[model samples]
Target chain A: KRAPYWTNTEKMEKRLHAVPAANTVKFRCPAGGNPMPTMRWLKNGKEFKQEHRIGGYKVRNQHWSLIMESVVPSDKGNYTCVVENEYGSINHTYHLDVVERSPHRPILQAGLPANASTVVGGDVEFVCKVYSDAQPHIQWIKHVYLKVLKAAGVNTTDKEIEVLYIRNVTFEDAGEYTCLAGNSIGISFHSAWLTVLPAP
Target chain B: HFKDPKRLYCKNGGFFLRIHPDGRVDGVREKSDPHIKLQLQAEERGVVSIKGVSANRYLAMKEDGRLLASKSVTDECFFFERLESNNYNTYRSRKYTSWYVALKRTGQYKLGSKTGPGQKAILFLPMSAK
Candidate 1:
């Protein structure tokens, strides 16, 4: 029988893959031979027996593939899939690189300086409307005299999510307000107004 | 939101301090009518730089105590916000603490240097335009 040879793995194996930390990654290696070959996995020239216990990786000899459940910085290294059955050996080398997650910036989805109105005894919704890769922490500040700013909804801070809703609003609800969205990375601000008109 | 735009309603004669399109610092008689919108910018927590939305001019008091909505921005444009004992707010020139923004009973801007904080002309109640 002839020696095993690689096919259809030209693009992915040789290139360095920068996998983000805490993500799943899969690599497939396949070979053809006159006699069926048995595959072996080598991580930086070190042999693996069914499972790579250090990195929570498992090899599937059925299709000659390696799967990483959650990649981390220490898991970065060169990987080789070698096939041999006494005729000869064929191999493919792949590189894995780990990278930190990108910074999370809370972006205000709507336009800034927004204005909203609701009559006295009506409802008003003030939205921070922030989006980010991380769980954004939301808070609201206000501009008013102590008389107006101390009222309900205006005095509250450090909300778990977006939207500050006020029910049965009063004239004191008419003032300027600001929204603050924060994450582990950074913080952002958006200012707006909520005017409460008199009900006839 | 860069700044807040509220009608600076004077305590006297149901008037609002206005900076018109013609670059005049004056007053409009309106308890519930149209008054030229003035954009209020905060330079400090209590200090604001007021500019007219209609004229694209700043509401400033001059060296001669004359109130004018001028095109150029300078120290004259900033005012110190004050909350009087009556819950009404007053704006004093940041450059001169005693110089107040005042409007007379007939809807005319009184001289800034001549007015005191206790006068009716120097007090204002902020009102929302829309």
Candidate 2:
């Protein structure tokens, strides 16, 4: 008999942000092989059982899912899915990170750029620094004249500081640049104007 | 033909290949850590590329014939053969057949050329996990 193998090869870190208290969190395991694999779920190495708050299901004998209802802080831990058959057994583990909802929204700490006047063909950078209880997603948006454009070179990976690099700024680059920060709680933004003087 | 392909936690000198988020790889002592978990992807007949599950890097042989973690997989990342013996497995690079992943007596990890399977430092015990 062939051992069960996981079909989901892509490495993914499933993230959930500020889920409601009564909401449910679900994890799905999709695998296939001969003789059909029996599946079980484990929370922090201990066998997880079905209850009012915990549930599991199988679909067509090839897919399995684990659901946790009314998730609380105690629900955050490592969850492993084990699939076994006559041949062998395999286990895959996932980390569940739960962030409690914060009453206050994200706050801009510093680094918000100010109005500036620069000569055409100059380089300018707009930086945004933000703090939040939950992980914040930051984006830089620019409004030039009548057009709205996304600022280039905004590093999304840097959570604390995000920089927008404007290379060889031209008259068209003169605009109101806004740094937008959002989280599960709320969204906040700050804007600065740029005036590009004609080259002498 | 073979038992279900499994993740091989190759260990040597009390240390395992540990991959970090900043793309740095080192031989660390934590066996239970997830960074040392590697998925051996079969490239051809006996060739395979050791991929880090958590770091998203591949065990690669650098131009200097050293072992390191690479951000992207390339030809140099392929290990020609996985030779299993009584207690450990030996991995030889596809390009430099003479070079083998080895652990120095000083506890350093590198690719040593002209190494034989009999060399204790070149032998890596494959520790399987649940």
Candidate 3:
């Protein structure tokens, strides 16, 4: 008579969460079988690269780690770890948060003040406001006839999305206006109306 | 089988209505013409019929027995197939004409829905491609 010996199988059980500033952070997956596990990080649905202090983590055995340097606010969300072998495979998810201050509020203003239904045909300024260390970009949009028109410019420190000049304010130029302020933190929008009346 | 020629009359423009013992009504077929087939059945009422002859020659009737057809044709062949029970009403038109042929059912019928009675109807129209 003969007997065969059996061994108990091990599985991945723990998940992790971390908050780091503009610096590199390393994550190591737990150990398993003869080989280590592989770790990967995804930021807002894209593969994360670990270059410039923020690069890919090296993988070995049943464990893997992602070394993210200068972890900006954009580098936040879930990191998936997948471990596999001839017998089976398992996966784990880790949540990440990058703490940072809010960028300037995107300012949307009209060429004229509110309640001012009419403006003359001339250059008009649309202003956007923000207060952040990051320089924001400003964009202008005009909604007319079920379509949107766009324009872009750099913003000043006072945190304003401003449009310097609007040429030829005709009856057709009269419509709703939108200003978008955006930086690494993302974008904000504000809107107003410009009414051009026919010459008396 | 009543085969008497006088028992049925072949009206102008080939329009005719057939009433069965079960009270269903159907429009007579106009030979091999795709433009000449139609049927209609209302819940309370029996049936009404119409047909087309030439491009200009067509059939139309008022509540009165007065009949009118396009200018030329005088008579058409009409056949009536009686149904055992009242079921459907349909209509067809003439070839190369701008009219539409359609079938519509009114009132309630259980088509197998737990939510209550549902009415089902369909219409067919010929379209020209640009």
Candidate 4:
């Protein structure tokens, strides 16, 4: 019988040659054998770790492919495909490039304090400020559940959105509190505390 | 007198069959001869019988049911066939790869069968039927 031979060109392409910080890159090997070639990646001559997102298909013959997902800067390096048949084997390799970017920070703010801290069974009032002209929603939240226990008020208009009022606070409400401000692109947060040592 | 005048030769790889009137298959090794062996089966009086092709190689059946043989040649393919009284027709084909080699490497020869009432055709060729 005649010995086996390779009959196609090998090429690797990344889904995004350039990506912003924290974005992912995708890549795949398009061809190989009737049963498909085995795909592998190397960075600086070392194999990629197993935790990297890698996947491929199992087929009966030569038509096969390989894929890599969520590519990171560390993944930018040399990759290879090694194929074989009963008669012989062959391999090919390529290089990948990844881009980096700067880190980002979220916004924060402060609001009014509550009125009643200690009461055996009575109510109190605490108020936090929403920065004026920011036109954000004002919420009274419990430190533990992180849920809004009360709504001070909402202001949808004005260049700066800020408004606040605390109707009543009770002994059960003794804990940390926060005021949050948000628009389409970003959010700001601030915290304060209300303590009830004992009901006098 | 040889009832079937066909010359059988062993080549490529496999057995060849030829039949005769004496109820005996004349075994021959034409090529790759030493590796093959033969077995013979026949039917008479509504009863069928089989005889192992002895090491003697040359096989002949006497009217009294005794087989005679002292020497024989070995070939690449072993040959055997059964011709019963009820069926006067027989057919044979080569095995894989061997079939392709037979057509590619050897001379032309047609497969055959024997037919006539009350006439027994004993398979004859030792290997390839020329």
Clashes of each: 1, 0, 36, 38
> What is the lDDT for A73 in model 4?
56
Candidate 3 residue spans exceeding 4 A from truth:
A1-100, A103-116, A119-123, A133-135, A145-150, A153-161, B1-130
Instruction: List model 2 lDDT by residue over A8-124, tens digit each.
Output: 653222321223334566677678879888988887898775541344422334347776666776666778888999998998876553323334455885547777789999988
Tell how far residue B11 is off in model 3, in angstroms: 99
Best by lDDT: 1
Per-residue lDDT of A1-200 in model 3, one digit per residue for the tens?
11211122222221323332554555555535434323345544456555523354544433355555667766667776555554555655555545443223333343332323455665455555433222344456777644434433211212222443467667777777766555433566667777677676
lDDT of 1 by residue, A1-200 (tens): 78887656553422444445676767777777878888877889988544454556777777678888777887778888788877998777766656444444567876754779988899877765665433344556777542222211212322323566678888977888877765445678788888888789
Candidate 1 Cα errors over 4 Å, as ranges: A1-200, B1-4, B31-35
Taking all chains together, each candidate's TM-score versus the true structure is: 0.40, 0.36, 0.25, 0.23
Arranged by TM-score with the best first, the candidates are 1, 2, 3, 4
Off by over 4 Å in 4: A1-24, A32-47, A52-64, A101-200, B1-130
- In model 1, the clashing pairs are A113-B1
Stretch of 10 with least lDDT, candidate 1 chain B: B39-48
What is the DockQ score of candidate 2, to 2 decimals? 0.02
User: Candidate 2 falls in which docking quality class?
Assistant: incorrect
Candidate 2, position B103, lDDT: 66
The DockQ of each candidate is 0.01, 0.02, 0.01, 0.00
Best by DockQ: 2
Score candidate 2 by TM-score against the native: 0.36
In model 4, what lDDT does residue A16 have? 18
Per-residue alpha-carbon lDDT of candidate 4 for residues B1-130, written as tens digits (9 for 90 to 100)? 1111223322211133322233334332232333224332211111111222324243333333323332432221212222222211221211111111111012222212221222222212222112
Candidate 2 vs candidate 3: which has greater DockQ? 2
**lDDT tens string, model 2, B1-130?**
0112223333333456666656665665544777877665444434566767788888877767777778887777877544343324577888877788776544467655646767766655444433
| Candidate 3 vs candidate 4, lDDT winner | 3
